[PDB]
Amino acid sequence: DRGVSTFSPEGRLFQVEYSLEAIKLGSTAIGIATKEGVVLGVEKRATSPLLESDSIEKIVEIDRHIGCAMSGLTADARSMIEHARTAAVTHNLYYDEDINVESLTQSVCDLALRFGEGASGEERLMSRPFGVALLIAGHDADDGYQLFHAEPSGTFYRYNAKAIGSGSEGAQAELLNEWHSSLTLKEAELLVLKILKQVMEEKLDENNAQLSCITKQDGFKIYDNEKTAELIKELKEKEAAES
Amino acid sequence: LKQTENDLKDIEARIKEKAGVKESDTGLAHPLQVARCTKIIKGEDAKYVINLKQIAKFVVGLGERVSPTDIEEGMRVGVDRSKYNIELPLPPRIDPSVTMMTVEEKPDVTYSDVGGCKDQIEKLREVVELPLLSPERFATLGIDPPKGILLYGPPGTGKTLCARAVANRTDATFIRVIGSELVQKYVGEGARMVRELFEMARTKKACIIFFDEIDAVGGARFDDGAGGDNEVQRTMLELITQLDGFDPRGNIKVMFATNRPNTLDPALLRPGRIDRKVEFSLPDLEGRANIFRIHSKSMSVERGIRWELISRLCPNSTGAELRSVCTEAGMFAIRARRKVATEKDFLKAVDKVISGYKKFSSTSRYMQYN
Amino acid sequence: NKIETLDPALIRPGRIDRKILFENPDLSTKKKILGIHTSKMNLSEDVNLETLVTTKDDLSGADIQAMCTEAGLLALRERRMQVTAEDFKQAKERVMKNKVEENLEGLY
Amino acid sequence: GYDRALSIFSPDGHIFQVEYALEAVKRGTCAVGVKGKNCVVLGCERRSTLKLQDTRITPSKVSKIDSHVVLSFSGLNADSRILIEKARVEAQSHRLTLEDPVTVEYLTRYVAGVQQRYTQSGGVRPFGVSTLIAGFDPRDDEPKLYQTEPSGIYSSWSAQTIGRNSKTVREFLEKNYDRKEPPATVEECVKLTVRSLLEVVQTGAKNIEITVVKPDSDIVALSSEEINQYVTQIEQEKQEQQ
Amino acid sequence: KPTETYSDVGGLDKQIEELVEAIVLPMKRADKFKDMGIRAPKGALMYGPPGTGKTLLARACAAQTNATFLKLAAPQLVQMYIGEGAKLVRDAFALAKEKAPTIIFIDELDAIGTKRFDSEKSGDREVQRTMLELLNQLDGFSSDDRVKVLAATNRVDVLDPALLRSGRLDRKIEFPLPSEDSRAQILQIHSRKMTTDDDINWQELARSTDEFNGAQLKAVTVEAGMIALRNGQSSVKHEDFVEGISEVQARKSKSVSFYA
C-alpha cells in the first residue's frame, strides 16, 4: 500500500483503528470486579469434538494477588509474560510489595504499546499494535479491587464491569443494569454464566469455557472442571427458579 | 386479421391525415438533427428562410415576427447547430437529434441493506423527494437541496442496490448513462452528444439521470495523459460547464458510481458539483438483523429458530454478502433436500460460505483515501 | 487459467457463486476417464488399461486425448484397428516430457 | 539493515502472511499422528513418486529434541529445520540451566515464541511452518499432541493431523476412534493410522513411513512389509455384504 | 447585466484592483495609454475552485462594464474534424470586432490546455493551432475596444513561457487560502438570503475553519438549515452554523475507540 505513517482523516493510525476487528474473531470474555473477589472468565467453545481443553490456557496469572485474561490471537498474550510478569517481579525486586493495579496497568501500557516504522534506541519493529484483548484485574492495598483492561488500541480506562469479544455489543448493553455496588461474589458467579449462555452458541460445558477468581487472601485460583461443572448445575437450577 | 380491417378506416382517414398535409403540398412530403426544409416556399424582414446543409446555407439576423403562420414546408425549423432559434411560430425546437439514449420505465428494486442506511437513505430522500414535498421551506430558510452526490464502495454489495431502490419511489423519468461506452472516438460524441441530454434535462422536467462509470470519465493525472484520454478528461470538464454558468437543481439530479471516492480529479471532487457524499462501509451487527428478516419474509423458515446465534458467526459484512449465506442455504435444501430453512443450515452456511467458500478474492485494503 | 486477481472486480457477492479448480484424479477417477475413452477403441487384449494408471504423473483427459491419437496414427500406418503396447508408453513420454513439468518441489 | 516491517496489519483481520502460511501445509505432504497410553505414533508420507533413495540416507520429517521426544511435522523444509536446531539448543539450554529435560508444553511455546517475533517484530518475515509436537515428560509416560499454527496459536489434540485433505481424513477418527477410551496395545494405534493413510497417498506404499515413539529412548520405524499386513484386513469384512 | 457584482464577490478586490487597469480602463479612456504607448492586455488567467471567483467573477465584469457577454467553453473548441474549432478562432474575433464590445470567456481551459511538452501533442493538431492562432493574432485584431480574450479553469498544470506579453495574458491568479477575516466576507455573501437569530459572531466561526475556500464555505450555509429541518426550527442559529461543520464533507464524522 503505502507508508504506515499515514494517518486517518481524524489523525489516527490505521492499525490502531482496525485493531478492533481481530478482537471479535477471538473468544468472548466478560470480567467483573465485585465487593468480594474479582470474577474472571473466558469462552473456549470448540474447534472440533476431539479438542482437549486441559492444555490450553486462555487465562494466565501475572502475580498471585492479580490476574489476567485474553481475547484475540494468542501471540501477543505471551509478549506480556516477558514484560508484565517481569515488571511485577521487578517491582518486588526493588520495592518488594504488591504493585498497585492502577499503577501496574499504566506501567504495563508503557511496555505494552511500542511500535512504529523504526527507531535505533526503542524497538518499533512491531507492526500490529495488538492482536488480543488483555484483561488486568487484582486487589489494591489502598483502594481495593480494580478491574482494568488492555485495549487493542493501547489505551487504558477504569472499568467497573467490562465486556470484550464479538458479543461485547449486546452483553455490555444489558450489563449496565446488571452490575451493582451490592453485587457479591456468589451472586456474580451465576450472573456471568447466565450472560454467557446467551453468548455461547453451543450448550454450556466445562470444556467450552474457563472461569477463575482473584482473592485478596488465597490469590488467583482457577476453577477445576469438577468445580466448574458444579456452577453449571447451579445455573440450571437457578434459571428454573426465576419464573 | 385485425390489421387487415384496421386499414379500412385508416386509409379513409389517411385523406383526413392528408388534409393537414394539404396546407403545404410542395416538396413532396419534433426530433431533428439539423433544421431542413425544401426551399421554404412559405417563409426589416418579413419572410424567414434558413437552412443548414451541404447546399444553400442560409442565415438571417432578424426574426421574431409571423411570416409562416406556424409550421411550414419541411416542418423542421428550430434549434440545431445551437446559434439558431425560431421561437415565435410554435417551434419544434430543442428536440433530441439522432443519438443513442437508454430510457426505461419503472426500475423496480426492493429494499436490500437497511443496516447502516437508516439515516443514510434519508440523505438520499433529501435530494429528490425533498423538493417534491415542501418547496416553501427552501425560500423561507434560504437553503437548497443537494444536487450532486457520490457513491463509493465495493461493487454492488447493497450500495448500488439502494441506489436503484430509492429511484423507483421517485416516480419520475429514469435515464441510465454509463462512462465506459462514453469514450468512443470522435470529439464531441462523449460531450456534445451528451450535452444534448443535459440541455433536454432543462426542457423536459421531472427527469432523473444517474451518471455511471465515472472511473472511465474522471481520474487524477500526473503527466497529463498518455494520449487518447483528453476527450475522456474533456467530458469531465464538459460536465462542469452545465453546472458552471447556470442550472436549476429542482428537476435535475447528479449521482456518480465508483469503487473509491478520491480516485477522481481532486478538482472534480471539489464541492458544488457534489453537495453530499454517500459513505458506504460495513455496518454494525444488530443493524443488519433486518436483512435476515427481509430475505425471510418470503422464505419459509421453521418456527423457533434463533437469529442471535446465527449473526454471531457472521462478522461485519454487507447486505449482499448476507444473501449469499441464504443463497447457499437454499442449495442445502436442494441436495440434502430440506423441507424448510432450518437453524443448522444457517449455522453451517456461514462457515460454508464466508469461511469455506469465500476465502480470498474480496475488497478489503483497496479503499483508504487516494 | 488463474482468475484470482481477476475475480473480485466482477463476481460480486452472490450474483455468480461457483468455484471449480483442476483436481489431481485418484485411482478411481483415472479408471473412468481412460476406460470410457476405450469404449469405441480397439487394442491388444493382452494389455491392461490399468497398468499405467497405478504409477503416473498428472495425466488428465486432455493428456489421454493425444495418447490415443498419437498411438492410433502409428498403428494406422500398418492399417490395423488395434494398437500395440509399444505405442502406449511411447505416447505417454512425449506428452509428459512437453506440457507436464513440475516445480521440482519435494518433501515439504 | 531493514528498519521497516515485512508484515502489515489487516483492517478486517485477514493477513497476507497468515493466508499462505497455512496453505504451505496444504501444498506439502500430510503428517498423521495419534496419541496413546504408553506411547505415541506419528505417520507421514512422501510427495515424490519415483524413489531412487533410501529412508535412512535422506531424512525428511525425522527430528529429535529430547532422548524420548521425537518431533515430526510438515509445514515446510528449509524454514522447518531452522526451528528444530534452535529447539535443540534450547533443549540443551535447559540442560545447561534447569539440568532437567523440558516438558512438551514449553517445547511448543518456544517454537511459537520464535514465530511470535516474526508476526510481531519487523525486519524478518514469518514462516509457513506448522509443527505437530509429541513426546513425553520426565518420569511420565503420558504423551502430548500440540498443533502449532504459524501465527503462534497452539492447542491440545489427539487424532489431529495436518496436510493435504487432512480435515476430511480426521473426520474418520472423530467417531471410530474414541479419545475417552484410548487403545492399549502399541499395534492398535497403527491399525487406525494405516487406514487413514490410504485416503491420501493410496498406492505407492514406498512413500508411506511410520515412526512410533516409545519411552526409555526407543524409536521403531515400521517397514513396508508390516504395513501390508493391515491392508489385507481392510478388505476382509468391508467387501462382504451382510 | 447579471446579478453578480462587486458586492456578490469577496477577497478578489486585490485582483480586481489590478483587473481594472487591464480591461476596464482601456475600454473607455485611451488617452493616457496612447501617450505612453502602453497596450493593455485583452484579459488575464485565473484558476481555482468555483464560487469564490472565476465564473461568477467573469460574469460580474460584464455587468460593471456593460458589454456583450460571449461565452464559449474550451472542450467545445476541440472538434472531431480538421480545424473545425480552429477556424472559429478568427471567426469568434471577427464577430466580436464588428458588433458591440464584448469579453470572450473560456470555460475550463484544461480541456484545450492538457498538452505539456510530450510527443502526444500530435494526437490533436487542432489544439495547438488554436493556441498559436490566439497568440499571434492579438496584434492584428487590436486597435479597438470590442475584442477581449479571457480564459479560466480549475487548475493550471501547464506552464507556458510564451503566454507572457503586454497584449497576451497578464495576470496569473491563484486563489489564496482565505484567512479569518477573508472567510467572513465570503460567508456574508451566501447569508444574505439566510434568516438568522443575530447570535452569530463572524470572527468566531472563521477561527474554527482552516483552509476552506468559498466552494467549501458555501456548503456550510446550505447544510446549516438542513440541520434545523429535522428540529423544526423557524430559522437557523449560531449553533446550526457549527452543525454545518458537523455535516460530512471533509470527513468530519464520528468513529469508534478513543472517543465515544
mmCIF file of N, CA and C in Angstrom, chain B residues 27-123:
data_model
loop_
_atom_site.group_PDB
_atom_site.id
_atom_site.type_symbol
_atom_site.label_atom_id
_atom_site.label_comp_id
_atom_site.label_asym_id
_atom_site.label_seq_id
_atom_site.Cartn_x
_atom_site.Cartn_y
_atom_site.Cartn_z
ATOM 1 N N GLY B 27 -42.765 20.254 -52.450
ATOM 2 C CA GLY B 27 -41.627 19.499 -51.962
ATOM 3 C C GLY B 27 -41.950 18.096 -51.504
ATOM 4 N N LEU B 28 -42.960 17.465 -52.100
ATOM 5 C CA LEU B 28 -43.385 16.099 -51.760
ATOM 6 C C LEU B 28 -43.758 16.097 -50.278
ATOM 7 N N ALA B 29 -43.280 15.146 -49.481
ATOM 8 C CA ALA B 29 -43.536 15.161 -48.047
ATOM 9 C C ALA B 29 -42.227 15.119 -47.267
ATOM 10 N N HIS B 30 -40.571 18.103 -32.073
ATOM 11 C CA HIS B 30 -40.336 17.163 -33.164
ATOM 12 C C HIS B 30 -38.839 16.953 -33.376
ATOM 13 N N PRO B 31 -38.379 15.718 -33.184
ATOM 14 C CA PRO B 31 -36.936 15.448 -33.227
ATOM 15 C C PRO B 31 -36.344 15.751 -34.595
ATOM 16 N N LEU B 32 -35.196 16.424 -34.587
ATOM 17 C CA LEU B 32 -34.479 16.744 -35.811
ATOM 18 C C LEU B 32 -32.994 16.861 -35.499
ATOM 19 N N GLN B 33 -32.164 16.480 -36.470
ATOM 20 C CA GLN B 33 -30.723 16.691 -36.341
ATOM 21 C C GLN B 33 -30.385 18.155 -36.602
ATOM 22 N N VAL B 34 -30.545 18.592 -37.848
ATOM 23 C CA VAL B 34 -30.432 19.994 -38.215
ATOM 24 C C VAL B 34 -31.695 20.394 -38.961
ATOM 25 N N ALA B 35 -32.086 21.658 -38.807
ATOM 26 C CA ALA B 35 -33.333 22.132 -39.395
ATOM 27 C C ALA B 35 -33.206 22.162 -40.911
ATOM 28 N N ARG B 36 -34.099 21.448 -41.591
ATOM 29 C CA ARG B 36 -34.039 21.301 -43.038
ATOM 30 C C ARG B 36 -35.445 21.318 -43.613
ATOM 31 N N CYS B 37 -35.639 22.112 -44.664
ATOM 32 C CA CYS B 37 -36.878 22.132 -45.428
ATOM 33 C C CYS B 37 -36.514 22.235 -46.904
ATOM 34 N N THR B 38 -37.527 22.220 -47.767
ATOM 35 C CA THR B 38 -37.314 22.363 -49.204
ATOM 36 C C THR B 38 -37.697 23.781 -49.608
ATOM 37 N N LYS B 39 -36.683 24.611 -49.863
ATOM 38 C CA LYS B 39 -36.823 25.957 -50.416
ATOM 39 C C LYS B 39 -37.549 26.905 -49.462
ATOM 40 N N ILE B 40 -38.229 26.349 -48.457
ATOM 41 C CA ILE B 40 -39.103 27.085 -47.545
ATOM 42 C C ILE B 40 -39.924 28.085 -48.352
ATOM 43 N N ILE B 41 -40.849 27.578 -49.171
ATOM 44 C CA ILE B 41 -41.586 28.443 -50.091
ATOM 45 C C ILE B 41 -42.449 29.437 -49.324
ATOM 46 N N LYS B 42 -43.096 28.982 -48.251
ATOM 47 C CA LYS B 42 -43.871 29.869 -47.392
ATOM 48 C C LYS B 42 -42.998 30.984 -46.830
ATOM 49 N N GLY B 43 -42.032 30.622 -45.993
ATOM 50 C CA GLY B 43 -41.166 31.601 -45.360
ATOM 51 C C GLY B 43 -41.703 32.058 -44.019
ATOM 52 N N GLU B 44 -36.264 46.084 -42.212
ATOM 53 C CA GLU B 44 -36.820 44.912 -41.544
ATOM 54 C C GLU B 44 -36.973 43.752 -42.521
ATOM 55 N N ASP B 45 -37.450 42.617 -42.018
ATOM 56 C CA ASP B 45 -37.639 41.419 -42.824
ATOM 57 C C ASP B 45 -39.012 40.830 -42.535
ATOM 58 N N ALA B 46 -39.642 40.284 -43.575
ATOM 59 C CA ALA B 46 -40.955 39.668 -43.434
ATOM 60 C C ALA B 46 -40.839 38.149 -43.407
ATOM 61 N N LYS B 47 -40.557 37.544 -44.559
ATOM 62 C CA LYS B 47 -40.411 36.099 -44.635
ATOM 63 C C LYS B 47 -39.053 35.668 -44.096
ATOM 64 N N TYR B 48 -39.013 34.458 -43.539
ATOM 65 C CA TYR B 48 -37.811 33.918 -42.907
ATOM 66 C C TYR B 48 -37.524 32.541 -43.490
ATOM 67 N N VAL B 49 -36.407 32.421 -44.203
ATOM 68 C CA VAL B 49 -35.987 31.172 -44.829
ATOM 69 C C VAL B 49 -34.543 30.917 -44.421
ATOM 70 N N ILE B 50 -34.315 29.859 -43.646
ATOM 71 C CA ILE B 50 -32.968 29.477 -43.235
ATOM 72 C C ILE B 50 -32.849 27.961 -43.303
ATOM 73 N N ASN B 51 -31.756 27.483 -43.894
ATOM 74 C CA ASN B 51 -31.477 26.058 -43.971
ATOM 75 C C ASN B 51 -29.974 25.853 -43.851
ATOM 76 N N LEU B 52 -29.581 24.814 -43.114
ATOM 77 C CA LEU B 52 -28.180 24.424 -42.983
ATOM 78 C C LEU B 52 -28.023 23.003 -43.505
ATOM 79 N N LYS B 53 -27.300 22.856 -44.604
ATOM 80 C CA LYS B 53 -26.998 21.556 -45.195
ATOM 81 C C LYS B 53 -25.874 21.764 -46.205
ATOM 82 N N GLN B 54 -25.548 20.707 -46.952
ATOM 83 C CA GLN B 54 -24.449 20.769 -47.907
ATOM 84 C C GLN B 54 -24.701 21.768 -49.029
ATOM 85 N N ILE B 55 -25.944 22.204 -49.218
ATOM 86 C CA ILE B 55 -26.310 23.108 -50.301
ATOM 87 C C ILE B 55 -27.153 24.239 -49.730
ATOM 88 N N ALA B 56 -26.815 25.476 -50.100
ATOM 89 C CA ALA B 56 -27.597 26.667 -49.768
ATOM 90 C C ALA B 56 -27.723 26.848 -48.251
ATOM 91 N N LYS B 57 -26.591 27.204 -47.646
ATOM 92 C CA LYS B 57 -26.555 27.553 -46.230
ATOM 93 C C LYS B 57 -27.070 28.977 -46.051
ATOM 94 N N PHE B 58 -28.079 29.145 -45.201
ATOM 95 C CA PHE B 58 -28.752 30.424 -45.027
ATOM 96 C C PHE B 58 -28.527 30.960 -43.618
ATOM 97 N N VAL B 59 -28.586 32.283 -43.489
ATOM 98 C CA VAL B 59 -28.513 32.946 -42.191
ATOM 99 C C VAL B 59 -29.305 34.245 -42.269
ATOM 100 N N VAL B 60 -29.998 34.576 -41.180
ATOM 101 C CA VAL B 60 -30.791 35.799 -41.081
ATOM 102 C C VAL B 60 -30.581 36.392 -39.695
ATOM 103 N N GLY B 61 -30.332 37.700 -39.637
ATOM 104 C CA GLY B 61 -30.082 38.363 -38.373
ATOM 105 C C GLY B 61 -31.333 38.732 -37.600
ATOM 106 N N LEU B 62 -32.421 39.019 -38.309
ATOM 107 C CA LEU B 62 -33.656 39.467 -37.684
ATOM 108 C C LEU B 62 -34.586 38.277 -37.452
ATOM 109 N N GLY B 63 -35.803 38.547 -36.994
ATOM 110 C CA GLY B 63 -36.773 37.490 -36.774
ATOM 111 C C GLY B 63 -37.865 37.948 -35.821
ATOM 112 N N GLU B 64 -38.499 36.955 -35.189
ATOM 113 C CA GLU B 64 -39.479 37.166 -34.121
ATOM 114 C C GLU B 64 -40.748 37.861 -34.623
ATOM 115 N N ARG B 65 -41.176 37.531 -35.842
ATOM 116 C CA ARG B 65 -42.441 38.007 -36.392
ATOM 117 C C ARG B 65 -43.071 36.888 -37.211
ATOM 118 N N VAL B 66 -44.364 37.020 -37.505
ATOM 119 C CA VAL B 66 -45.111 35.933 -38.133
ATOM 120 C C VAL B 66 -45.063 36.153 -39.640
ATOM 121 N N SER B 67 -44.149 35.464 -40.321
ATOM 122 C CA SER B 67 -44.332 35.097 -41.721
ATOM 123 C C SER B 67 -45.125 33.801 -41.905
ATOM 124 N N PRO B 68 -44.663 32.671 -41.343
ATOM 125 C CA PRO B 68 -45.146 31.369 -41.830
ATOM 126 C C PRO B 68 -46.559 31.019 -41.409
ATOM 127 N N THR B 69 -47.042 31.540 -40.277
ATOM 128 C CA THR B 69 -48.238 31.029 -39.607
ATOM 129 C C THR B 69 -48.034 29.552 -39.251
ATOM 130 N N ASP B 70 -47.201 29.364 -38.231
ATOM 131 C CA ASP B 70 -46.754 28.111 -37.568
ATOM 132 C C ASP B 70 -46.006 27.251 -38.599
ATOM 133 N N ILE B 71 -46.287 25.946 -38.687
ATOM 134 C CA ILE B 71 -45.422 25.038 -39.431
ATOM 135 C C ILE B 71 -45.414 25.381 -40.918
ATOM 136 N N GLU B 72 -44.276 25.126 -41.563
ATOM 137 C CA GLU B 72 -44.092 25.437 -42.972
ATOM 138 C C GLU B 72 -43.219 24.381 -43.638
ATOM 139 N N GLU B 73 -43.625 23.963 -44.840
ATOM 140 C CA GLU B 73 -42.821 23.100 -45.703
ATOM 141 C C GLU B 73 -42.325 21.848 -44.990
ATOM 142 N N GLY B 74 -41.003 21.707 -44.879
ATOM 143 C CA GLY B 74 -40.383 20.536 -44.289
ATOM 144 C C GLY B 74 -40.617 20.356 -42.806
ATOM 145 N N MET B 75 -41.370 21.261 -42.176
ATOM 146 C CA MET B 75 -41.872 21.100 -40.815
ATOM 147 C C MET B 75 -40.757 21.163 -39.773
ATOM 148 N N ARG B 76 -39.500 21.068 -40.199
ATOM 149 C CA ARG B 76 -38.380 21.118 -39.266
ATOM 150 C C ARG B 76 -37.751 22.503 -39.345
ATOM 151 N N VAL B 77 -38.037 23.321 -38.336
ATOM 152 C CA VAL B 77 -37.365 24.592 -38.091
ATOM 153 C C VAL B 77 -37.251 24.748 -36.582
ATOM 154 N N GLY B 78 -36.070 25.088 -36.107
ATOM 155 C CA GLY B 78 -35.858 25.199 -34.683
ATOM 156 C C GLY B 78 -34.418 24.893 -34.338
ATOM 157 N N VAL B 79 -34.204 24.601 -33.056
ATOM 158 C CA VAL B 79 -32.853 24.558 -32.514
ATOM 159 C C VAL B 79 -32.069 23.418 -33.152
ATOM 160 N N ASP B 80 -30.940 23.772 -33.754
ATOM 161 C CA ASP B 80 -29.904 22.890 -34.265
ATOM 162 C C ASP B 80 -28.658 23.754 -34.307
ATOM 163 N N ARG B 81 -27.475 23.124 -34.342
ATOM 164 C CA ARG B 81 -26.189 23.821 -34.504
ATOM 165 C C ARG B 81 -25.960 24.802 -33.352
ATOM 166 N N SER B 82 -26.920 24.867 -32.436
ATOM 167 C CA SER B 82 -27.212 25.956 -31.495
ATOM 168 C C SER B 82 -27.405 27.233 -32.319
ATOM 169 N N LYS B 83 -27.074 28.405 -31.773
ATOM 170 C CA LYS B 83 -26.927 29.613 -32.581
ATOM 171 C C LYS B 83 -28.192 30.013 -33.333
ATOM 172 N N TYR B 84 -29.194 29.140 -33.327
ATOM 173 C CA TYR B 84 -30.319 29.239 -34.246
ATOM 174 C C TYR B 84 -31.605 29.020 -33.471
ATOM 175 N N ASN B 85 -32.441 30.051 -33.411
ATOM 176 C CA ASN B 85 -33.694 29.995 -32.669
ATOM 177 C C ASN B 85 -34.800 30.544 -33.559
ATOM 178 N N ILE B 86 -35.737 29.684 -33.929
ATOM 179 C CA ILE B 86 -37.045 30.103 -34.407
ATOM 180 C C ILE B 86 -38.022 29.724 -33.306
ATOM 181 N N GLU B 87 -38.560 30.736 -32.632
ATOM 182 C CA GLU B 87 -39.426 30.564 -31.473
ATOM 183 C C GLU B 87 -40.867 30.956 -31.771
ATOM 184 N N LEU B 88 -41.075 32.217 -32.138
ATOM 185 C CA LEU B 88 -42.394 32.838 -32.228
ATOM 186 C C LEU B 88 -43.487 31.959 -32.831
ATOM 187 N N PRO B 89 -43.230 31.099 -34.133
ATOM 188 C CA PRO B 89 -44.347 30.337 -34.741
ATOM 189 C C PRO B 89 -44.440 28.880 -34.293
ATOM 190 N N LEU B 90 -44.675 28.669 -32.990
ATOM 191 C CA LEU B 90 -44.885 27.341 -32.404
ATOM 192 C C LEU B 90 -43.763 26.375 -32.777
ATOM 193 N N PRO B 91 -42.589 26.517 -32.172
ATOM 194 C CA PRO B 91 -41.387 25.861 -32.694
ATOM 195 C C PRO B 91 -41.347 24.383 -32.353
ATOM 196 N N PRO B 92 -40.846 23.581 -33.232
ATOM 197 C CA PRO B 92 -40.326 22.249 -32.853
ATOM 198 C C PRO B 92 -38.828 22.324 -32.569
ATOM 199 N N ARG B 93 -38.474 22.955 -31.452
ATOM 200 C CA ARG B 93 -37.088 23.289 -31.167
ATOM 201 C C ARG B 93 -36.638 22.649 -29.860
ATOM 202 N N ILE B 94 -35.315 22.567 -29.702
ATOM 203 C CA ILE B 94 -34.659 21.825 -28.628
ATOM 204 C C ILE B 94 -35.284 20.437 -28.561
ATOM 205 N N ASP B 95 -35.009 19.620 -29.572
ATOM 206 C CA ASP B 95 -35.543 18.275 -29.663
ATOM 207 C C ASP B 95 -34.402 17.299 -29.907
ATOM 208 N N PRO B 96 -34.471 16.098 -29.335
ATOM 209 C CA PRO B 96 -33.337 15.171 -29.437
ATOM 210 C C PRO B 96 -33.048 14.790 -30.881
ATOM 211 N N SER B 97 -31.784 14.928 -31.269
ATOM 212 C CA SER B 97 -31.342 14.584 -32.612
ATOM 213 C C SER B 97 -31.042 13.089 -32.673
ATOM 214 N N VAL B 98 -30.451 12.638 -33.780
ATOM 215 C CA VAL B 98 -30.044 11.242 -33.879
ATOM 216 C C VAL B 98 -28.955 10.985 -32.849
ATOM 217 N N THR B 99 -29.179 10.000 -31.986
ATOM 218 C CA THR B 99 -28.279 9.721 -30.870
ATOM 219 C C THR B 99 -28.669 8.378 -30.267
ATOM 220 N N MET B 100 -27.932 7.976 -29.233
ATOM 221 C CA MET B 100 -28.180 6.737 -28.503
ATOM 222 C C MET B 100 -28.572 7.098 -27.075
ATOM 223 N N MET B 101 -29.830 6.842 -26.723
ATOM 224 C CA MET B 101 -30.350 7.143 -25.397
ATOM 225 C C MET B 101 -30.987 5.893 -24.810
ATOM 226 N N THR B 102 -30.676 5.610 -23.548
ATOM 227 C CA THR B 102 -31.258 4.484 -22.825
ATOM 228 C C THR B 102 -32.327 5.024 -21.884
ATOM 229 N N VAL B 103 -33.589 4.734 -22.195
ATOM 230 C CA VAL B 103 -34.726 5.197 -21.409
ATOM 231 C C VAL B 103 -35.607 3.996 -21.102
ATOM 232 N N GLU B 104 -35.776 3.697 -19.820
ATOM 233 C CA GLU B 104 -36.623 2.607 -19.360
ATOM 234 C C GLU B 104 -37.720 3.165 -18.458
ATOM 235 N N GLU B 105 -38.572 2.269 -17.965
ATOM 236 C CA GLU B 105 -39.703 2.659 -17.138
ATOM 237 C C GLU B 105 -39.807 1.730 -15.939
ATOM 238 N N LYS B 106 -40.057 2.320 -14.768
ATOM 239 C CA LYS B 106 -40.269 1.607 -13.513
ATOM 240 C C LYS B 106 -39.100 0.687 -13.174
ATOM 241 N N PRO B 107 -37.936 1.233 -12.806
ATOM 242 C CA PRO B 107 -36.838 0.373 -12.344
ATOM 243 C C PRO B 107 -37.104 -0.152 -10.943
ATOM 244 N N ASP B 108 -37.902 -1.212 -10.844
ATOM 245 C CA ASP B 108 -38.404 -1.673 -9.556
ATOM 246 C C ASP B 108 -37.319 -2.455 -8.823
ATOM 247 N N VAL B 109 -36.927 -1.960 -7.650
ATOM 248 C CA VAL B 109 -35.950 -2.618 -6.787
ATOM 249 C C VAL B 109 -36.425 -2.481 -5.348
ATOM 250 N N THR B 110 -36.480 -3.600 -4.629
ATOM 251 C CA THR B 110 -36.919 -3.589 -3.242
ATOM 252 C C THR B 110 -35.760 -3.202 -2.324
ATOM 253 N N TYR B 111 -36.032 -3.185 -1.021
ATOM 254 C CA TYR B 111 -35.005 -2.842 -0.047
ATOM 255 C C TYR B 111 -33.966 -3.952 0.049
ATOM 256 N N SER B 112 -32.701 -3.556 0.198
ATOM 257 C CA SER B 112 -31.600 -4.513 0.285
ATOM 258 C C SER B 112 -30.892 -4.414 1.631
ATOM 259 N N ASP B 113 -30.103 -3.369 1.866
ATOM 260 C CA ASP B 113 -29.373 -3.192 3.117
ATOM 261 C C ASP B 113 -29.939 -1.975 3.837
ATOM 262 N N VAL B 114 -30.684 -2.219 4.918
ATOM 263 C CA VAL B 114 -31.158 -1.156 5.796
ATOM 264 C C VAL B 114 -30.306 -1.009 7.048
ATOM 265 N N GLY B 115 -29.255 -1.815 7.196
ATOM 266 C CA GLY B 115 -28.472 -1.844 8.419
ATOM 267 C C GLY B 115 -27.830 -0.525 8.795
ATOM 268 N N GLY B 116 -27.022 0.026 7.896
ATOM 269 C CA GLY B 116 -26.433 1.333 8.078
ATOM 270 C C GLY B 116 -27.078 2.420 7.256
ATOM 271 N N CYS B 117 -28.139 2.098 6.523
ATOM 272 C CA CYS B 117 -28.810 3.031 5.631
ATOM 273 C C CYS B 117 -29.996 3.734 6.281
ATOM 274 N N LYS B 118 -30.217 3.526 7.582
ATOM 275 C CA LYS B 118 -31.319 4.156 8.305
ATOM 276 C C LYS B 118 -31.373 5.658 8.051
ATOM 277 N N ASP B 119 -30.379 6.393 8.542
ATOM 278 C CA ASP B 119 -30.262 7.815 8.248
ATOM 279 C C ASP B 119 -29.515 8.087 6.950
ATOM 280 N N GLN B 120 -28.940 7.055 6.331
ATOM 281 C CA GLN B 120 -28.201 7.228 5.087
ATOM 282 C C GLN B 120 -29.142 7.339 3.891
ATOM 283 N N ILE B 121 -30.249 6.591 3.905
ATOM 284 C CA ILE B 121 -31.259 6.746 2.863
ATOM 285 C C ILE B 121 -31.964 8.090 2.998
ATOM 286 N N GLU B 122 -32.136 8.577 4.230
ATOM 287 C CA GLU B 122 -32.777 9.873 4.434
ATOM 288 C C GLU B 122 -32.025 10.988 3.722
ATOM 289 N N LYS B 123 -30.695 10.890 3.648
ATOM 290 C CA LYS B 123 -29.928 11.856 2.870
ATOM 291 C C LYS B 123 -30.244 11.748 1.383
#
